[PDB]
């Protein structure tokens, strides 16, 4: 479902917790969106296109809140 | 068994 390494790990927990399927389905949706952003961020790391920390903070901010809305 | 002498 996901190319992302650590997002695959997070995605397995929500299956184990049997969360709300609609919210569970939406959880896959934004994680699929985030993985594109996450790969884009670290694409810049090999391209050297960021040095201000924006492309890391913007993604971990949503992830940290996702830890609250999904117990992760 | 069947093979023991």
């Amino acid at each position: 479902e996901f190319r992302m390494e650590k997002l695959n790990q997070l995605w397995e927990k929500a299956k184990r917790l049997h969360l709300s399927p609609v919210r569970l389905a939406e959880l896959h949706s934004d994680l699929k969106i985030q993985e594109r952003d996450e790969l884009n961020w670290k694409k810049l790391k090999v391209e050297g296109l960021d040095g201000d920390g924006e492309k890391e903070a913007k993604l971990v901010h949503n992830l940290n809140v996702i830890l609250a809305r999904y117990g992760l | 068994x069947x093979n023991x002498x």
Partner: protein
């Protein structure tokens, strides 16, 4: 001086014909961007010809793409054309290169670290993550297969009503158990799970996985065992278009009219890329040294006969006919370029056909073979059939010596090895010590040695032809992997020309091994497609190794190194046990039919049955001078100078001195000094010939060759032969010696001066105290040494399991086959790692083992239909009526179980429903058996032996009307007992007829030593048996009242009556007047004491 029979002198050549002997505007969009041809869109660099229309651009992919015209460089490490990465890309599992070739999870992987903000569960392989955030640690559920997550310094509770207790002290809901998943890390929820069978929509792997059908042949290993991607499951047969069609390159069939008609009917021009050019006539691409043939559109080469074609499709190679197809020429074959020559071995004449070799000797061969009680004399044509010997216990194997015409055999009942001249004289026993279980033996006619296999010790032995100088040659395992080891050694043959010893083993890992006659070069010859190799032999005129198999039912032969295995019988034999070769014929014995067969040795044609047998025939040899070929002894004279065994070197060129078992092979440059090193429980002969057990010392017969075994001043021998004598004269079994338990009344069996240097058997291990126990009992969680030295925790942590065995975590050592068999053999389940057992490395041998349905256990195919739960699934017994029994050797029970015919009417149930022992007519008793009244057959030695063997004393009638074997002594009542028991001082006849006429054993008239009361009928009994109420000697002198006055009464054991007799306690108040005076029945003793 003679010319050897049928041979020629060593200084002559033999003509093969007869045998006569003869003498020898981009809107500022150009920084790392290009145009999309639209006034608002801009292609970023490297994105054109990426494969996707990432921008609405007409220049993206108008077939202007060059895949590898310009390739990536090392600044961004390359993985595929147009795709290159670096950093943590190279091993993270992300799709970086478009095909995951950026890592292939192989290169630059297997080296990682994890940050402190996480916790690194390093015990997980890359398919399982090894780094999880600290928040995940004890969050409530685990994430690593290592599963230290929830157990890293975190508490627990007292479970729940609907949860299951895992072995790691944690509880989880019962819906996860028995689901084929590691729900608490240690598979504790998966132990002892009887998994449900798979359904129609689910493919079944080798291990129970119940995988759905989508992944079958999906080119990804999803079963773990590769069972879903088997090469023959995804088998794609080649479409050939056999008849008047043609096979296109793409796989189409078109009729013959659609070939070479100037129309591409195959859509790949396979029918038109030709039609007029003859490459065979090109005489430049044909390159065929042999003839060529140009078909409709192309050419091909074709070799002349005697030559083979290879990969290049142009060249030819000479066939090595004497190795590829040895069936062409009987006996020796010599390969030539493009042809072959057949040559008979010296002593055989070549018939004009060029393929038959006939023996030139005037001596006609015959078969000597052994039954339970009989060694028999059968000619090769079956015309004459006579008996050589009878009355033997169990002749499991035999062999003959050509040089001095002796016959050697193993009596498996008495566990002795005997020998005898072929005129039936000088029968004698050469080995009668140790020899726990010998199965097969072979006589070395060249170096004058004897070799045999022991099944319990699991050893290969060597000895002199008189039986002296026993040495243990091979042991443990035979390959470097320690996979094949001595389990059930059976069948042995020698090849003195090459100096090798061949033997087979029908253990779980069945094999055929080879070793040097000195033990140097042990190796594995055959290890594949073999289950029960009971038979082995060599054709000496061909250097071909012949062996049989009782399970797969075949007879097969190969070269001496094990290559080119050619099948003679394609699995149609019920149960061969032994076989032999002569000229062009195989002789072998079957157990299921109890017959001796005969057939051609190369194709099995002309199979005929030679004779029936009422008992199983075990060992068979063709007695002929040609079956033990003449060669010069490497140990010419004086045993090559060795004072002990002179053994042939591997390769048959040199020789090696060796010492017996209880000796040290101290090596010098000139001599191997055999320094005797026998244990303190053994006695060394004066001349250092051998060290015998100590209980043989002064036993009355000369065990030592020099006579030092019986010195003048040693005490009178009270015990029998083979019994240990305490210092006071009382007797104990040899196993009582140094067993850490006081057997002798004075402790004579446990003295430190006797047990200090005591040494145990090769199959036993010595405790802290000198008690010996079997090696399988160590670290078994039971105190077997009486001081728990076998179960010592430090000892179990430091010990190393025997080669070919597997060590558990708790120190227990178990056989290798017991690992990963869906059974807790270790007790702690250390032998059953589910992640490792469910792998292709532990598959079942397609040729011989059967795989259970719902788990990964493998069982041998002969366990199917047997009536037992071989698979814990019980899946080897379901619907087993489908299998057919063997057409000739198997009798089918009423419940569809097959059993060997030899068990039919054997007198015991072998089916379960007793259908084998029904409609049964009693068999014919053989030559040396005696028939009871109820039609049962018993050995004739059992008649008049004072035992009710038939069941109704039918064999005990009219004993005094007949004599018996000369080795027996006939009592007055007519019964027979062995002569050695007569005139020995104890009553062995029930009437005590022995010892009743023997002369005085001493001069002063006394018949017995002064320590023992002698009964008037001249028998000796031990003095504490007197007055005990039992007629220990038939004259009654040991119970006479007057001479019994000199005795006390032991109140806790015996009680005195009105008569001075002191009867045992249980007779008091028993209701029977035992003393004859009613004192035992005086009722005052039948109340509360």
């Amino acid at each position: 001086p003679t010319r050897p029979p049928g041979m020629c002198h060593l200084d002559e050549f033999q003509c093969q014909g007869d045998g006569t002997c003869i003498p020898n505007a981009s809107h500022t969009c150009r920084s790392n961007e290009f145009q999309c041809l639209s006034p608002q869109r801009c292609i970023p660099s490297y994105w054109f010809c990426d494969g996707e229309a990432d921008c609405a651009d007409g220049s993206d992919e108008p077939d202007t793409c060059g895949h590898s015209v310009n390739t990536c460089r090392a600044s961004q490490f390359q993985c595929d054309n147009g795709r290159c990465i670096s950093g943590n890309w190279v091993c993270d599992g992300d799709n970086d290169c478009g095909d995951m070739s950026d890592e292939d999870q192989r290169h630059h992987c297997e080296l990682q670290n994890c940050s402190s903000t996480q916790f690194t569960c390093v015990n997980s392989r890359p398919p399982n993550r090894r780094c999880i955030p600290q928040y995940w640690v004890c969050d409530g559920d685990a994430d690593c297969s290592d599963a230290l997550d929830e157990l890293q310094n975190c508490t627990m509770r007292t479970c729940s009503a609907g949860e299951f207790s895992c072995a790691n002290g944690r509880c989880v809901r019962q819906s996860f158990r028995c689901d084929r998943r590691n729900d608490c890390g240690d598979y504790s929820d998966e132990r002892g799970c009887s998994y449900p069978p798979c359904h129609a929509n689910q493919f079944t792997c080798q291990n129970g996985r119940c995988i759905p059908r989508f992944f079958v042949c999906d080119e990804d290993n999803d079963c773990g065992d590769g069972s879903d991607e088997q090469e023959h499951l995804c088998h794609t047969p080649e479409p050939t278009c056999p008849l008047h069609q043609f096979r296109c390159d793409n796989g189409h069939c078109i009729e013959m009219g659609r070939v070479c008609n100037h129309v591409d009917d195959c859509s790949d021009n396979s029918d038109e890329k030709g039609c007029g050019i003859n490459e065979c006539l090109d005489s430049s691409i044909s390159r065929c040294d042999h003839n060529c043939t140009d078909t409709i559109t192309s050419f091909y080469c074709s070799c002349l006969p005697g030559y083979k074609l290879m990969s290049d499709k142009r060249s030819c190679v000479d066939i090595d006919e004497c190795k590829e197809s040895p069936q062409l020429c009987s006996q020796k074959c010599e390969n030539v370029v493009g042809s072959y020559i057949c040559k008979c071995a010296p002593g055989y004449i070549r018939e004009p056909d060029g393929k038959s070799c006939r023996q030139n000797s005037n001596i006609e061969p015959y078969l000597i073979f052994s039954n339970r009680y009989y060694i028999r004399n059968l000619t090769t044509d079956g015309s004459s059939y006579s008996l050589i010997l009878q009355g033997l216990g169990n002749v499991v194997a035999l062999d003959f010596d050509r040089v001095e015409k002796r016959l050697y055999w193993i009596d498996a009942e008495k566990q002795i090895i005997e020998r005898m001249f072929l005129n039936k004289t000088n029968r004698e026993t050469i080995i009668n010590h140790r020899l726990r279980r010998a199965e097969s033996l072979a006589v070395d006619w060249v170096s004058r040695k004897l070799y045999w296999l022991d099944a319990i010790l699991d050893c290969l032995f060597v000895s002199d032809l008189e039986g002296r100088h026993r040495k243990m040659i091979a042991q443990h395992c035979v390959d470097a992997n320690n996979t094949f080891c001595f389990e059930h050694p059976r069948g042995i043959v020698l090849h003195p020309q090459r100096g090798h010893v061949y033997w087979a083993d029908w253990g779980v890992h069945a094999y055929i091994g080879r070793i040097g006659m000195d033990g140097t070069n042990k190796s594995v010859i055959i290890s594949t497609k073999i289950e029960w190799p009971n038979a082995i032999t060599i054709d000496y005129t061909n250097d071909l190794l012949y062996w049989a198999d009782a399970h797969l039912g075949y007879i097969e032969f190969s070269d001496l190194e094990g290559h080119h295995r050619h099948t003679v019988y394609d699995g149609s034999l019920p149960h061969p046990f032994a076989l032999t070769i002569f000229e062009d014929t195989v002789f072998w014995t079957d157990w299921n039919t109890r017959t001796v067969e005969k057939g051609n040795k190369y194709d099995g044609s002309g199979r005929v049955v030679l004779v029936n047998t009422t008992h199983k025939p075990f060992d068979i040899h063709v007695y002929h001078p040609y079956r033990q070929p003449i060669m010069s002894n490497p140990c010419g004279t004086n045993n090559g100078g060795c004072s002990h065994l002179c053994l042939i070197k591997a390769g048959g060129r040199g020789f090696t001195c060796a010492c017996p078992d209880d000796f040290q092979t101290v090596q010098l440059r000139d001599r191997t000094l055999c320094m005797p090193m026998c244990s303190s429980t053994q006695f060394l002969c004066g001349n250092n010939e051998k060290c015998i057990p100590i209980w043989w010392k002064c036993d009355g017969q000369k065990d030592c060759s020099d006579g030092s075994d019986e010195p003048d001043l040693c005490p009178h021998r009270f015990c029998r032969l083979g019994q240990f004598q305490c210092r006071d004269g009382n007797c104990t079994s040899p196993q009582a010696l140094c067993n850490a338990r006081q057997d002798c009344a004075d402790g004579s069996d446990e003295d430190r001066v006797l047990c200090e240097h005591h040494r145990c058997e090769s199959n036993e291990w010595q405790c802290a105290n000198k008690r010996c126990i079997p090696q399988s009992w160590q670290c078994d969680s039971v105190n077997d040494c009486l001081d728990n030295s076998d179960e010592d925790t430090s000892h179990c942590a430091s010990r190393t399991c025997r080669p070919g065995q597997f060590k558990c975590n708790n120190g227990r050592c178990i056989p290798q086959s017991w690992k990963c068999d869906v059974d807790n053999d270790c007790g702690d389940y250390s032998d059953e790692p589910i992640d490792e057992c469910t792998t292709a490395a532990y598959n079942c041998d397609n040729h011989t083992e059967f795989s259970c349905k719902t788990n990964y256990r493998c069982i041998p195919q002969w366990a199917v239909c047997n009536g037992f739960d071989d698979c814990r699934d019980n899946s080897d017994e379901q619907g087993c009526e489908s299998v057919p029994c063997h057409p000739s050797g198997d009798f089918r029970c009423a419940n569809h179980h097959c059993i060997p015919l030899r068990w039919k009417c054997d007198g015991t149930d072998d089916c379960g429903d007793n259908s084998d022992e029904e409609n049964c007519v009693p068999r014919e008793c053989s030559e040396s058996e005696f028939r009871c009244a109820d039609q049962q057959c018993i050995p004739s030695r059992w008649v008049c032996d004072q035992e009710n063997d038939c069941g109704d004393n039918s064999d005990e009638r009219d004993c005094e009307m007949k004599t018996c074997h000369p080795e027996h002594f006939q009592c007055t009542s007519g019964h027979c007992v062995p002569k050695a028991l007569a005139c020995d001082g104890r009553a062995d006849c029930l009437d005590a007829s022995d010892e009743s006429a023997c002369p005085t054993r001493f001069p002063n008239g006394t018949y017995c030593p002064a320590a023992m009361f002698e009964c008037k009928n001249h028998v000796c009994i031990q003095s504490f048996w007197i007055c005990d109420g039992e007629n220990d000697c038939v004259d009654g002198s040991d119970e006479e009242i007057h001479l019994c006055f000199n005795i006390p009464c032991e109140s806790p054991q015996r009680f005195r009556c009105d008569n001075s007799r002191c009867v045992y306690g249980h007779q008091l108040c028993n209701g029977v007047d035992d003393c004859g005076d009613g004192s035992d029945e005086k009722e005052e003793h039948c109340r509360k004491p």
